[PDB]
mmCIF file of C-alpha atoms and ligand atoms in Angstrom:
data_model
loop_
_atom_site.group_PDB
_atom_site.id
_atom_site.type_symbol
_atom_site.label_atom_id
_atom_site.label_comp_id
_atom_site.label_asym_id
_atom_site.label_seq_id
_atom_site.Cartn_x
_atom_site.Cartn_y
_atom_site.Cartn_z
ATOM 1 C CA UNK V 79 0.000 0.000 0.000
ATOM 2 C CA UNK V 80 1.766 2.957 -1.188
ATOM 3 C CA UNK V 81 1.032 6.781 -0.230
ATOM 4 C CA UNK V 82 -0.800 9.133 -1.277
ATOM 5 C CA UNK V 83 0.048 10.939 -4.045
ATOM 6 C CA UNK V 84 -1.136 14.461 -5.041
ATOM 7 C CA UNK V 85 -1.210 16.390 -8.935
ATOM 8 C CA UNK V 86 -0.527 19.193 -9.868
ATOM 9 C CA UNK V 87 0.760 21.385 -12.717
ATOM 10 C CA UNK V 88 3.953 23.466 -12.910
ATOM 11 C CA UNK V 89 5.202 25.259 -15.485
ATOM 12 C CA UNK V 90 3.112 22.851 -17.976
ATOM 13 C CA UNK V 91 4.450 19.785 -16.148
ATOM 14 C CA UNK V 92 2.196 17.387 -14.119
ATOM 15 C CA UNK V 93 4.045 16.635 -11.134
ATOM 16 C CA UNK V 94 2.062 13.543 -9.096
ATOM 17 C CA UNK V 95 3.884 12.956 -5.686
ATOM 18 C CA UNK V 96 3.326 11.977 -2.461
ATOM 19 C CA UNK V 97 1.838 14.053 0.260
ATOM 20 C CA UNK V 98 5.170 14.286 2.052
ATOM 21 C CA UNK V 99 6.479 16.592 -0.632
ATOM 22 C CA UNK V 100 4.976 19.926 -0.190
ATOM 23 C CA UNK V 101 5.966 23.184 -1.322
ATOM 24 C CA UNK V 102 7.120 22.117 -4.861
ATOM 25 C CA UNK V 103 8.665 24.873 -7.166
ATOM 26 C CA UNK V 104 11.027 24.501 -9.946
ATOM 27 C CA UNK V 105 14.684 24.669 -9.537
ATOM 28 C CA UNK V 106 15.689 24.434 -12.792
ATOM 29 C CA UNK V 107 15.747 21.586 -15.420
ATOM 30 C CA UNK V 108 17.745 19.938 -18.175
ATOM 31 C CA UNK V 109 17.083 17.719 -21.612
ATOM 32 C CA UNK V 110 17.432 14.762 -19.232
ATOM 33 C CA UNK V 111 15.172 16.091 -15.925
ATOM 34 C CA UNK V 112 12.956 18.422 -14.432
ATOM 35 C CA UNK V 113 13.713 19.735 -11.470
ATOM 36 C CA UNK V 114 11.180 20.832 -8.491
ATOM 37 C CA UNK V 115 12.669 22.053 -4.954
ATOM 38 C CA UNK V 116 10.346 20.860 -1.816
ATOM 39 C CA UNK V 117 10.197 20.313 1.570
ATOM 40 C CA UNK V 118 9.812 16.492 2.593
ATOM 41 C CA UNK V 119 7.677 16.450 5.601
ATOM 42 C CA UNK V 120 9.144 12.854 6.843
ATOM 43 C CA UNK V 121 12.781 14.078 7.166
ATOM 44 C CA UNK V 122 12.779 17.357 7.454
ATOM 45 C CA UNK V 123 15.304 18.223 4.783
ATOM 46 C CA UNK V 124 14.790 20.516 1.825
ATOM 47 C CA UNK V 125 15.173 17.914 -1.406
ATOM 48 C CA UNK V 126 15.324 17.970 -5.188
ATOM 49 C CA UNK V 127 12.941 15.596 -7.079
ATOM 50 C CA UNK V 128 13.493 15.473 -10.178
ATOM 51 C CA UNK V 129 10.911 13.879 -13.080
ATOM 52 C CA UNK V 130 12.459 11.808 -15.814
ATOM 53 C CA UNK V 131 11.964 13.047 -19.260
ATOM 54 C CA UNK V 132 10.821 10.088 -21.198
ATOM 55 C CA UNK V 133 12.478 7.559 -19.088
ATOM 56 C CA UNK V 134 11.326 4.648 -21.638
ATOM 57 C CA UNK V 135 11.005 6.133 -24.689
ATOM 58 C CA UNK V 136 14.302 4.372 -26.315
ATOM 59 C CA UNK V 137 15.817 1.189 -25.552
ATOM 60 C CA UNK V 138 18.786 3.712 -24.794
ATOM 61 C CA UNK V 139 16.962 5.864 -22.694
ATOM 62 C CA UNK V 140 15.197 2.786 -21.076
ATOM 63 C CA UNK V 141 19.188 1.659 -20.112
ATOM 64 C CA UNK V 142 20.247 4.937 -18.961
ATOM 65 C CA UNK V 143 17.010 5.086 -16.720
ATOM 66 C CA UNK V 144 18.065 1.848 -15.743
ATOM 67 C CA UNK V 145 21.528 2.358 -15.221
ATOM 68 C CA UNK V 146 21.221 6.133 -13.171
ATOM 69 C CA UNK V 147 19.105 4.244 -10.944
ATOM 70 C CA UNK V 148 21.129 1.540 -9.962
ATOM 71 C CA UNK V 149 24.217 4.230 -9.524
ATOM 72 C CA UNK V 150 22.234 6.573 -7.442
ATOM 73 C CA UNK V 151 20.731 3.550 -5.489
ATOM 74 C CA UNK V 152 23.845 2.317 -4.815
ATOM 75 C CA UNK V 153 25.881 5.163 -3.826
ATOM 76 C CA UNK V 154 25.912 5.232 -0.134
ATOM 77 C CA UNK V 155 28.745 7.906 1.103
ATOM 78 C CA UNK V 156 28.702 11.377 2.356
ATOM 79 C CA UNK V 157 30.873 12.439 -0.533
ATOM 80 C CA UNK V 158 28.592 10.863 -2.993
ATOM 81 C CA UNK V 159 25.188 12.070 -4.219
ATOM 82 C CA UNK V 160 22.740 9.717 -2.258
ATOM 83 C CA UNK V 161 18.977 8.130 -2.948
ATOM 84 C CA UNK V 162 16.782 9.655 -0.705
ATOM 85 C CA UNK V 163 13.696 7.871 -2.475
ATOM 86 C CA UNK V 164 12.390 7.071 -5.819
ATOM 87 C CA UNK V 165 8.905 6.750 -6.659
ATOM 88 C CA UNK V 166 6.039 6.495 -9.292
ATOM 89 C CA UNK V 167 2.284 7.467 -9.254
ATOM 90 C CA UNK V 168 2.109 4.128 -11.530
ATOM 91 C CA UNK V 169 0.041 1.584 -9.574
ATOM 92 C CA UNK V 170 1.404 -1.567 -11.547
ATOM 93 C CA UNK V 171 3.682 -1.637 -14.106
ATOM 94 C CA UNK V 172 1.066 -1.673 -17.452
ATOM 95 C CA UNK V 173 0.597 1.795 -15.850
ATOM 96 C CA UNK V 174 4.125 2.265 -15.232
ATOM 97 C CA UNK V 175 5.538 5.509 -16.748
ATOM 98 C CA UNK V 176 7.207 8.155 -14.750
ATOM 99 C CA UNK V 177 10.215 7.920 -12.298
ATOM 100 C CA UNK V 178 10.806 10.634 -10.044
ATOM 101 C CA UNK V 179 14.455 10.884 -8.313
ATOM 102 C CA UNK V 180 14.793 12.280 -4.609
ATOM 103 C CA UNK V 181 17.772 13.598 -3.493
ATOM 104 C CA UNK V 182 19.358 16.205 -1.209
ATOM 105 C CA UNK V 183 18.577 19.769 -2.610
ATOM 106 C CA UNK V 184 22.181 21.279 -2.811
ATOM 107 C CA UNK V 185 22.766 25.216 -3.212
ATOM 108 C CA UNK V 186 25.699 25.671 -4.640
ATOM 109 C CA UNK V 187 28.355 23.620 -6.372
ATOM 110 C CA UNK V 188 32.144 24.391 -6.321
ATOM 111 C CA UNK V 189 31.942 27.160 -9.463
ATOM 112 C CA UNK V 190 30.222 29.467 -6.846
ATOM 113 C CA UNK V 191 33.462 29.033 -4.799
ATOM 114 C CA UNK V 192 36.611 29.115 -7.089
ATOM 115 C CA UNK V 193 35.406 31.530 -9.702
ATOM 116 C CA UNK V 194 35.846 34.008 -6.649
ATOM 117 C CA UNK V 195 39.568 33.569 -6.890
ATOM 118 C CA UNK V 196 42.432 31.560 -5.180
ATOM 119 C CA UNK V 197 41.690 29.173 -2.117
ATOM 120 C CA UNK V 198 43.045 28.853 1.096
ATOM 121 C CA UNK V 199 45.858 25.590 0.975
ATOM 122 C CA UNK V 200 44.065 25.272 4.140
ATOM 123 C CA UNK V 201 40.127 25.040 2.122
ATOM 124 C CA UNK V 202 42.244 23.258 -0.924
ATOM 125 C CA UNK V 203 43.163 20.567 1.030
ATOM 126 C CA UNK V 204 39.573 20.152 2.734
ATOM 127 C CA UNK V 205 38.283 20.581 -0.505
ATOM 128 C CA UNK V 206 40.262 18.308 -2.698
ATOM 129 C CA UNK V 207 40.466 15.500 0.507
ATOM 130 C CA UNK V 208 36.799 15.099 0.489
ATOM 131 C CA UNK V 209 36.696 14.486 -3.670
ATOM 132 C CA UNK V 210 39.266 11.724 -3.272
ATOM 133 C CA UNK V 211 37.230 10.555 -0.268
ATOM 134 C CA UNK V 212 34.392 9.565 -2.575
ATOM 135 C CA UNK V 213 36.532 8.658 -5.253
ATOM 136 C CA UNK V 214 38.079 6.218 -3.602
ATOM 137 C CA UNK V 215 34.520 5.371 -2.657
ATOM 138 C CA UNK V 216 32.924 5.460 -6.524
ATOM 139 C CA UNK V 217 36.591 3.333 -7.428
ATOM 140 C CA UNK V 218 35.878 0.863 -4.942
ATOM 141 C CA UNK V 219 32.653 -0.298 -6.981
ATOM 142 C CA UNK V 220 34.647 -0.042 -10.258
ATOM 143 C CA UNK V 221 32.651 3.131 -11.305
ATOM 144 C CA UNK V 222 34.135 5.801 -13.272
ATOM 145 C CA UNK V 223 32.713 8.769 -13.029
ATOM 146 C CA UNK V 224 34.477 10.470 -16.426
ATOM 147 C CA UNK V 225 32.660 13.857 -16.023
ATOM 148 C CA UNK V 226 34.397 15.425 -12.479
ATOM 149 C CA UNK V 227 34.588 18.981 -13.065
ATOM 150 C CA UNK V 228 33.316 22.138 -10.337
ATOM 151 C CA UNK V 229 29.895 22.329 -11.698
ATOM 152 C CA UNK V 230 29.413 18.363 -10.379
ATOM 153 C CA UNK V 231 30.703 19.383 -6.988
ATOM 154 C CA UNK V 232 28.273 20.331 -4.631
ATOM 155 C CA UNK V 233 29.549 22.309 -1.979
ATOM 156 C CA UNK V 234 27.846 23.831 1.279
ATOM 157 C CA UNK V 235 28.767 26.903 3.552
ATOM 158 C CA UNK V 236 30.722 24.708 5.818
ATOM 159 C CA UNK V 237 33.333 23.405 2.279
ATOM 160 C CA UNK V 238 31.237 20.124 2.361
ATOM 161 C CA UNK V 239 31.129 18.496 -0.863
ATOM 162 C CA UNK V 240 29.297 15.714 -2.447
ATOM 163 C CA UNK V 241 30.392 14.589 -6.206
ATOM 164 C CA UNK V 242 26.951 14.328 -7.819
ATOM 165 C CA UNK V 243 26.089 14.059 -11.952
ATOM 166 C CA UNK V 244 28.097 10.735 -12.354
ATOM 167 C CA UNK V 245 29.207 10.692 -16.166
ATOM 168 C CA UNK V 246 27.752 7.177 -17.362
ATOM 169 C CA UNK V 247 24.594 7.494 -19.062
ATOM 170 C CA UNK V 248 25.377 10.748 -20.475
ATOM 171 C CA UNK V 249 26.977 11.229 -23.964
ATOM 172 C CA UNK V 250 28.219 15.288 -24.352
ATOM 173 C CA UNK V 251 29.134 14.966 -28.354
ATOM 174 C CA UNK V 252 29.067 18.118 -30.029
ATOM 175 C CA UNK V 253 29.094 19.835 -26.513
ATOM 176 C CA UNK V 254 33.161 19.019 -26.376
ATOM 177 C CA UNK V 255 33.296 21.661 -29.020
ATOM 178 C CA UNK V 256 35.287 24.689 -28.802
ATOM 179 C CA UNK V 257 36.119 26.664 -25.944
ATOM 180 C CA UNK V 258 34.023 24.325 -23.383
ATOM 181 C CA UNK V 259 34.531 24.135 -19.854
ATOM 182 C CA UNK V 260 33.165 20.701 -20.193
ATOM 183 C CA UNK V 261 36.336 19.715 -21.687
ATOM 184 C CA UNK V 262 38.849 21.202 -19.834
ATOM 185 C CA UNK V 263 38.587 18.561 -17.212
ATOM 186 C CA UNK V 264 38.746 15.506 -19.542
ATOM 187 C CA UNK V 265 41.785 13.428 -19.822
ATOM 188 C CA UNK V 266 43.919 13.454 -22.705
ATOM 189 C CA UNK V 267 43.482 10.058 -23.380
ATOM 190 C CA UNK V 268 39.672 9.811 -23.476
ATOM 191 C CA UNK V 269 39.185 13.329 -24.482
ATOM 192 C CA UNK V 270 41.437 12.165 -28.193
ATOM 193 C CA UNK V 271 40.194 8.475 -27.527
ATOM 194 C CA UNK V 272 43.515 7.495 -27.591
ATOM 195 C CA UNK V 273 43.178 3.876 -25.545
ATOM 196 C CA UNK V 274 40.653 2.455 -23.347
ATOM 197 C CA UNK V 275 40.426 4.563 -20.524
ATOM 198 C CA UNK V 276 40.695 3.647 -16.513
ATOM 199 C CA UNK V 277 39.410 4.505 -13.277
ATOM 200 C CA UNK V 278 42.807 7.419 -13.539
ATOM 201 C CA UNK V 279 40.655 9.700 -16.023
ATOM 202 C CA UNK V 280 39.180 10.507 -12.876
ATOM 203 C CA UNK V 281 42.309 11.505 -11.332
ATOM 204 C CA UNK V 282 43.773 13.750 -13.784
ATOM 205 C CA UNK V 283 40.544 15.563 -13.436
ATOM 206 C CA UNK V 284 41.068 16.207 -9.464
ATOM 207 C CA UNK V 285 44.818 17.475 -10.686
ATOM 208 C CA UNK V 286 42.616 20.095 -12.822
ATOM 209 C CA UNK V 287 40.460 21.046 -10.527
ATOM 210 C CA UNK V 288 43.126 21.300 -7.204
ATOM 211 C CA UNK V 289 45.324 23.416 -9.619
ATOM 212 C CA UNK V 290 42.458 26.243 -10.448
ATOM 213 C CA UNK V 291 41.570 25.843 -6.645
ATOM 214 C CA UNK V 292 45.482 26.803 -5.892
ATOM 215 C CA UNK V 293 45.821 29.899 -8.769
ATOM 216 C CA UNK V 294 42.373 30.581 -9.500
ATOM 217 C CA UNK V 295 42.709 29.791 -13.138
ATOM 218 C CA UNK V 296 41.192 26.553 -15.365
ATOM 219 C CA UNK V 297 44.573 24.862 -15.969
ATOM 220 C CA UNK V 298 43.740 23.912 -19.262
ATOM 221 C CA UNK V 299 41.247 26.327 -20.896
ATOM 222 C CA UNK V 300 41.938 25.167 -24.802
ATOM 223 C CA UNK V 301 39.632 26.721 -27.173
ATOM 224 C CA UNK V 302 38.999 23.229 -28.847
ATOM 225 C CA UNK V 303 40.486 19.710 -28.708
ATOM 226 C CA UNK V 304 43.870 20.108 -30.410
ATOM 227 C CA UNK V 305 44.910 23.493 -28.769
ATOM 228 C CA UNK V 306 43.571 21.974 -25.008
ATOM 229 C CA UNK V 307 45.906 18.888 -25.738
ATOM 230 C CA UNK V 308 48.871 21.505 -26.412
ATOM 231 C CA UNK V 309 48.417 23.164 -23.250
ATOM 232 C CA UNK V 310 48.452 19.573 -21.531
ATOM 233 C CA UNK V 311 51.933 18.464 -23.564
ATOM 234 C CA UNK V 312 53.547 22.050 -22.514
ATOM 235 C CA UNK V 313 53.033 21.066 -19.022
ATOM 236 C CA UNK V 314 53.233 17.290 -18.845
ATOM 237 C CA UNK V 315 55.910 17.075 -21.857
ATOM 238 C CA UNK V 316 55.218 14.978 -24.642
ATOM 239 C CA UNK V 317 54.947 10.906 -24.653
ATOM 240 C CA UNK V 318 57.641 8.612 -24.678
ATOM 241 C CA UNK V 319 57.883 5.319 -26.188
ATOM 242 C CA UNK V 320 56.910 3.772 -23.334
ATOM 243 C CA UNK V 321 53.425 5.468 -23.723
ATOM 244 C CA UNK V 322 52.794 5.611 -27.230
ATOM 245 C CA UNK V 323 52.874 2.008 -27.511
ATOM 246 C CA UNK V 324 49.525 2.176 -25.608
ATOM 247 C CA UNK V 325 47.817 4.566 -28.002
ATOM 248 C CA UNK V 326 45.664 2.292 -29.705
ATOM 249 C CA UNK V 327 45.379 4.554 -33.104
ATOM 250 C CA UNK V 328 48.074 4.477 -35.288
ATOM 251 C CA UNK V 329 46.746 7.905 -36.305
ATOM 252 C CA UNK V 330 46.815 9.268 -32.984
ATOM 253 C CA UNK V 331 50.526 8.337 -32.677
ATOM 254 C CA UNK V 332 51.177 9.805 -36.072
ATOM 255 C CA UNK V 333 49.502 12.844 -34.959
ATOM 256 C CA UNK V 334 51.270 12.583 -31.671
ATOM 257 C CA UNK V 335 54.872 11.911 -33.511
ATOM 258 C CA UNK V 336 54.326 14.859 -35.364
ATOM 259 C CA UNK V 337 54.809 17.316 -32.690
ATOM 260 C CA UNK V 338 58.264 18.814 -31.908
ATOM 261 C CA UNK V 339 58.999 17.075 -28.312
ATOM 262 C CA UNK V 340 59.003 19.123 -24.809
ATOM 263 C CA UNK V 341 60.072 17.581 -21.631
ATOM 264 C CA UNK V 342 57.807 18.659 -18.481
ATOM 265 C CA UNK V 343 58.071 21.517 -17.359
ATOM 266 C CA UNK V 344 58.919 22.673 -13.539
ATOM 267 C CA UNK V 345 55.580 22.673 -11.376
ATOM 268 C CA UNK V 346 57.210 24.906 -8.523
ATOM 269 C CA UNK V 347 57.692 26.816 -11.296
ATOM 270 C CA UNK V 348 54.058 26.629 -12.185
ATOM 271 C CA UNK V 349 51.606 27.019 -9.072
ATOM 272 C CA UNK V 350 54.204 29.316 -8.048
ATOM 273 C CA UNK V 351 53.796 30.029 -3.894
ATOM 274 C CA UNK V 352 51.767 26.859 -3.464
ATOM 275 C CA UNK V 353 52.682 24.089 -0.656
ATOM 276 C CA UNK V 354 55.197 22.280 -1.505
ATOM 277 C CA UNK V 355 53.224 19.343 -0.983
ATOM 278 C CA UNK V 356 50.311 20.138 -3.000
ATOM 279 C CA UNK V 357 52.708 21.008 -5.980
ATOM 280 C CA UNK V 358 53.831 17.378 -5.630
ATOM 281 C CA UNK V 359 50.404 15.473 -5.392
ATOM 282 C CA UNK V 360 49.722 17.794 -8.097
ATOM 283 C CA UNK V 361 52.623 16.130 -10.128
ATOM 284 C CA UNK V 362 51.527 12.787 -9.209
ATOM 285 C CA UNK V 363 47.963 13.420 -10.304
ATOM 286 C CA UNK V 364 49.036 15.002 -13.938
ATOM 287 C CA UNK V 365 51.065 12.402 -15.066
ATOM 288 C CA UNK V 366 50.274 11.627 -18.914
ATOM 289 C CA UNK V 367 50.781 7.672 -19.201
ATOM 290 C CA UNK V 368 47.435 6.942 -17.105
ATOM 291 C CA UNK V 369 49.155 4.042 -16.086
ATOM 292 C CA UNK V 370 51.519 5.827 -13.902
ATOM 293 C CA UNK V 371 48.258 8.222 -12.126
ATOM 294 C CA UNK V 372 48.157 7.792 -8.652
ATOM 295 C CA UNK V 373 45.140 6.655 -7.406
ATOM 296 C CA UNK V 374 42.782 7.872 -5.639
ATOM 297 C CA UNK V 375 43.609 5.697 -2.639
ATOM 298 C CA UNK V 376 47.183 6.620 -2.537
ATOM 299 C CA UNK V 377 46.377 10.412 -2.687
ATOM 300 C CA UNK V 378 44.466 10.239 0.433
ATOM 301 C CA UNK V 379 47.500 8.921 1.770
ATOM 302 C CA UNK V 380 49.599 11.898 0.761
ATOM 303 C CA UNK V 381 50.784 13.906 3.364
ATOM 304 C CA UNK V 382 49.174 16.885 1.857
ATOM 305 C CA UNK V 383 45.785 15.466 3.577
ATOM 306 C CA UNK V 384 47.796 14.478 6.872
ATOM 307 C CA UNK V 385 45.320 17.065 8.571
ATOM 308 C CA UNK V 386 42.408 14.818 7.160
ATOM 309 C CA UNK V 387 43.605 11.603 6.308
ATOM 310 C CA UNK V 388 42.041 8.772 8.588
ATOM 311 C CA UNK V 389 42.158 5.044 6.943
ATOM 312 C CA UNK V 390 39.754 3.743 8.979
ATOM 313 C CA UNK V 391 37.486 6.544 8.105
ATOM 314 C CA UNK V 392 37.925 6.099 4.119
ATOM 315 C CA UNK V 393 35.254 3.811 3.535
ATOM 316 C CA UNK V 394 35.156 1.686 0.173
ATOM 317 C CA UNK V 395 32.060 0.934 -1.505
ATOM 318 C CA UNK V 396 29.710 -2.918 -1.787
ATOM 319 C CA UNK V 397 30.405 -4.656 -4.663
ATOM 320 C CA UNK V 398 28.231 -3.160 -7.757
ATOM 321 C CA UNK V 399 26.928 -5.118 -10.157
ATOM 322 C CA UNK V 400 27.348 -4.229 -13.797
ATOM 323 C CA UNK V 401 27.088 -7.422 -15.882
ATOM 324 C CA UNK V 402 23.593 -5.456 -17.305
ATOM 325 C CA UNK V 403 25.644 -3.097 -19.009
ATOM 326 C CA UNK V 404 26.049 -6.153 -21.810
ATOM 327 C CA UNK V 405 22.665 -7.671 -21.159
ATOM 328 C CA UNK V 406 20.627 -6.919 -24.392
ATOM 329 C CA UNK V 407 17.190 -6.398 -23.349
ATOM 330 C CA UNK V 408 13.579 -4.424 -25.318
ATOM 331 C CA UNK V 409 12.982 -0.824 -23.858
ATOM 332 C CA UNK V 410 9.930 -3.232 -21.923
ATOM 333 C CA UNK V 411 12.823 -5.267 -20.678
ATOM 334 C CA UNK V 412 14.364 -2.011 -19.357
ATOM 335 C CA UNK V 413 11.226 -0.436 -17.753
ATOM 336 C CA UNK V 414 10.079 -3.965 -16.293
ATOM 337 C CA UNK V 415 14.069 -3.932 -14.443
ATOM 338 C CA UNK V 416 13.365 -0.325 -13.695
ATOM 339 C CA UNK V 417 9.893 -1.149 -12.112
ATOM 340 C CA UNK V 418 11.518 -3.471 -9.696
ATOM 341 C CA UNK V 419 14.335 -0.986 -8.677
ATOM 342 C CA UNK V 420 11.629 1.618 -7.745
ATOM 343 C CA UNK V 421 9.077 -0.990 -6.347
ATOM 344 C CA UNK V 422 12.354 -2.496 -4.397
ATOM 345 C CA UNK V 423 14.049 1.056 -3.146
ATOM 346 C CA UNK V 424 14.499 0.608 0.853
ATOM 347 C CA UNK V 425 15.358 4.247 2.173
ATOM 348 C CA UNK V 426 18.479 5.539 4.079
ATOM 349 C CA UNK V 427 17.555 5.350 7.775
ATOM 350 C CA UNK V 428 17.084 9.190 9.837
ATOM 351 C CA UNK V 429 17.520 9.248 13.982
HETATM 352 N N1 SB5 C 705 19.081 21.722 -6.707
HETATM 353 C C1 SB5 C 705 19.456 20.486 -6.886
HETATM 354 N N2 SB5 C 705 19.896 19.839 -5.816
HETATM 355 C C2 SB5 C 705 20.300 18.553 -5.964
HETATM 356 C C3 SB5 C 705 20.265 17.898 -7.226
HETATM 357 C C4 SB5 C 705 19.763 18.687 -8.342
HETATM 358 C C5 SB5 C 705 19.680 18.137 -9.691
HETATM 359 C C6 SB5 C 705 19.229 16.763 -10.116
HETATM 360 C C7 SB5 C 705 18.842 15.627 -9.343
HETATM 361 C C8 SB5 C 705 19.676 14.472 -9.214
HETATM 362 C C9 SB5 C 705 19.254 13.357 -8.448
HETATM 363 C C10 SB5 C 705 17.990 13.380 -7.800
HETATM 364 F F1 SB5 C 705 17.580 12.306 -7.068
HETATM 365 C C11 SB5 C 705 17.149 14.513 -7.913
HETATM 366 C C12 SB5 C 705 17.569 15.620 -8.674
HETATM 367 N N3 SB5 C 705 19.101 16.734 -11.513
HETATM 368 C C13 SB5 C 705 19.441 18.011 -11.839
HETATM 369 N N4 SB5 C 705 19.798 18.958 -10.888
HETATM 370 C C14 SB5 C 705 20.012 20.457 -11.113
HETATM 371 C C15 SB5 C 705 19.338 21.006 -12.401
HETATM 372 C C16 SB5 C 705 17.818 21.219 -12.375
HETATM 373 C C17 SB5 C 705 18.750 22.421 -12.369
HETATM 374 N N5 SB5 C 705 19.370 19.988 -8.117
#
């Protein structure tokens, strides 16, 4: 026996949700969800619910319903963007249509924090400790996230941050173009598809986003794909052998061959005036062979975060099982899958 829901029509939307949801107004809204801001009467926090779209109107869109729903009901860390419930007015599944997504409702994310210049190393380290926190967490489960940037860091008025908009699902083409911040964050070797990418891509996005937190400025602000990756080589020097035996394209190392060679430059020399320390994690963290990336585990283990750092406190995530990612299901296959994920969701405890 479910509860009892309520409609109601906002901004040409019909938005049918339970009575513990009051106060709904828009917050914004995207090609993928709309977004309503509320108050939710059983816990006492302000959330976002968000309405999918057409959740099932594609055997693609049917996954990626699929798939965001499993992430977000999986992820269960303070550093993570959590499941606070999940519903539909749908009273079986022949009626079954429309997922709504409850989560936290967050203010502001990290842009709101940077773009007001430098950071304390004090606020950097907080700040940076807390994304390799969840990392670690997200790595654990053999997630990639392969979209960190500022805009998918929430962050609160006491430097909390959760890592929220997990990449997977989501497929930017033609939004990688030109002078994007969405691209500025991507790893050379995904953002040129040079190899098969790792869990690292997520790492060398950290080392982009600590460095603007340390001088204020996007470290690698390229006005499209080719001029970004020069930036990146006048830093990081260009690849060895060693490397460009893993580029899968023999165009790519053509390309790559073609340019005149420059060894890496001096980082002190760089984030001039920054710890010491956070100049070195930094060099650990933009290293161009992903291979050689420290992880996410190891950086928490840095003494940059010796202020923070407490292994037992670190957590690592359940295991999370993928194997649907190859299943080859109908878009009813999908929403049936989907069904059961809502009809299943058990919500985080309160006190
Ligand atoms: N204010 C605010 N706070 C938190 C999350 C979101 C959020 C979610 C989103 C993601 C997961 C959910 F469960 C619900 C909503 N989807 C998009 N946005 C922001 C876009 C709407 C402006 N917006």
């Amino acid at each position: 026996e479910r509860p009892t829901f309520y409609r109601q029509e906002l901004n040409k939307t019909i938005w049918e949700v339970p009575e513990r949801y009051q106060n709904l107004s828009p917050v914004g809204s995207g090609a993928y969800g709309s977004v309503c801001a509320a108050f939710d009467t059983k816990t006492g926090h302000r959330v976002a619910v968000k309405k999918l779209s057409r959740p099932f109107q594609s055997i693609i869109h049917a996954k990626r319903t699929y798939r965001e729903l499993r992430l977000l009901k999986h992820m269960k860390h303070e550093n993570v963007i959590g499941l606070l419930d999940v519903f539909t007015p749908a009273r079986s599944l022949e009626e079954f249509n429309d997922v709504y997504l409850v989560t936290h409702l967050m203010g502001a994310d990290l842009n709101n924090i940077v773009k007001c210049q430098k950071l304390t190393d004090d606020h950097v380290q907080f700040l940076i400790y807390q994304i390799l926190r969840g990392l670690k967490y997200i790595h654990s489960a053999d997630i990639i996230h392969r979209d960190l940037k500022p805009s998918n860091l929430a962050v609160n008025e006491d430097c909390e941050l959760k890592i929220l908009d997990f990449g997977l699902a989501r497929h930017t083409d033609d939004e990688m173009t030109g002078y994007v911040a969405t691209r500025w964050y991507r790893a050379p070797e995904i953002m040129l598809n040079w190899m098969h990418y790792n869990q690292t891509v997520d790492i060398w996005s950290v080392g982009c986003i600590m460095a603007e937190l340390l001088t204020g400025r996007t470290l690698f602000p390229g006005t499209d794909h080719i001029d970004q990756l020069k930036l990146i080589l006048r830093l990081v020097g260009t690849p060895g052998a060693e490397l460009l035996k893993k580029i899968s394209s023999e165009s790519a190392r053509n390309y790559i061959q073609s340019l005149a060679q420059m060894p890496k430059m001096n980082f002190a020399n760089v984030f001039i005036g920054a710890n010491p320390l956070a100049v070195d994690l930094l060099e650990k963290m933009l290293v161009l062979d992903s291979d050689k990336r420290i992880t996410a585990a190891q950086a928490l283990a840095h003494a940059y975060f010796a202020q923070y750092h407490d292994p037992d406190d670190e957590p690592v995530a359940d295991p999370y099982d993928q194997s649907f990612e190859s299943r080859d299901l109908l878009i009813d296959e999908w929403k049936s899958l989907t069904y059961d994920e809502v009809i299943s969701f058990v919500p985080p405890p309160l006190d």
